[PDB]
Amino acid sequence: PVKPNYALKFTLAGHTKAVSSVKFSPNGEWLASSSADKLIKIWGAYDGKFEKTISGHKLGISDVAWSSDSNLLVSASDDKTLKIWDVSSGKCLKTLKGHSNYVFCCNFNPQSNLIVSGSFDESVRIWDVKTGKCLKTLPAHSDPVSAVHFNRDGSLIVSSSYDGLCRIWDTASGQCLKTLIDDDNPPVSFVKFSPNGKYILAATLDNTLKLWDYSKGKCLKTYTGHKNEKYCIFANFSVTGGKWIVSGSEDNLVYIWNLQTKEIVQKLQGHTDVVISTACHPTENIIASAALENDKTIKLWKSDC
C-alpha cells in the first residue's frame, strides 16, 4: 500500500468552543472528546452518534485518556484538577488535586492502576487510580509539560515540554533515565511511545515530527511539510493498514506520511481551523481529527488501507 484513501465519513458537532483532544477507546467502540467548553463528550466510533456529555470541570479541558478497559476516562483541566470518570454511568469517581497550574496532559498506564499528568506548573505527577492519591511529584521540566505517556509495560514515562526537552522517567523510582534533544531547541509540543515502546514520536514547534530510537539516543526519522509553530498538536502511529504517521497542522489539514520513507501520502481537507488532535482507531483504518475555536468539530475519516 503506497497511499491510503481516507475520505470524510462523519462530523461530530456539539462542542461550543475549541476541541482540545480526541481519543478512541481501546476496545474501538467509543471516541472521547474534550473542549475549552468544560465538557467531555462520548461518541460512537463507527457511526459518529453522540452518546453523552460528562460535565463537572470548572474550566476548559485540554486532554482526556481512556483506561485499557474502555470503562474509565481521566481528564486534565485548566481548573488544575484531573477527574476520573465512570463512562458508562457518567459519574465522577475521584478528583485528583495537587497541581498548582493548568493540567495539560494525562494518561493511564497500560495496567490502568496509575495515571500520569503534566502541568503548566512544570511537574509530572503519578497517581494511584484506586485511592486518587498522588504517589510522586517529579520536577520534570522548566516550562509547561505538553505531553505524558507510559510505555507498553508501564515501566517508563516519556514527558515533553516547552523547555525543549523530551525526558524518560523510571515509573517505580521517578528517576530521570534520559533527556533527548537533537541540537535544536524549539519547544516540544507532543510525545508518545510507539506501540512496542521501542520508539518515541515527538513534535517540535518548528514544523517537525521526530522519531527517536530512545535506547540508542538517536533520532532515526523526521516527518516534515506540515505547519506547527504555535499549538500542541497530537500525532499518531497508524498501524491497522499501511504504516503511517498522522498529524494535525496549522493550515487546517490532516497530514499522513509513509512511516518508512517519510514522504507525505495524503492531506485531508475539511477543518476550518487548526487541527489540534488526531487519533487512530485500534482495529479499523479510521482517523479522528479535532479543530480549534473557528471549527469546533471532530471528524471521522475512513480508508480501505
Binding site: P195, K198, Y199, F237, V239, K243, L259, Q260
Partner: peptide, 9 residues
C-alpha cells in the same frame, strides 16, 4: 531503514 513500531521481534 525499515522499522517495526508494533512487534518486539
Amino acid at each position: 531503514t525499515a522499522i517495526d513500531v508494533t512487534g518486539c521481534v
